[PDB]
Nucleic acid binder design. Structure first.
Length: 66
DNA sequence: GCGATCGC
DNA sequence: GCGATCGC
């Protein structure tokens, strides 16, 4: 499958892109929210660390219209 | 500070 | 409403 590896307040997680909910660019980073077993988690990676799948999801988000 | 959110 | 949070 495709997991994104990231750090958040220490906890170095690696979430299934299928659990990613929203993705957006903040500066040169790719930020996102994800389903964290019911809660909404937050993560961000540098673009070089972002697997293509996440960048595909980002491009999809970037094409969204009103 | 940028986006966007959570968690308070 | 905003600090923390991520990368930078």
């Amino acid at each position: 499958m495709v997991k994104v590896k990231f750090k958040y307040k220490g906890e170095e997680k690696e979430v299934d892109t299928s659990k990613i909910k929203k993705v957006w660019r903040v500066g040169k980073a790719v930020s996102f929210t994800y389903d964290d077993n019911g809660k909404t988690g937050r993560g961000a990676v540098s673009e070089k660390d972002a697997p293509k799948e996440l960048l595909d999801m980002l491009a999809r988000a970037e094409r969204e219209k009103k």
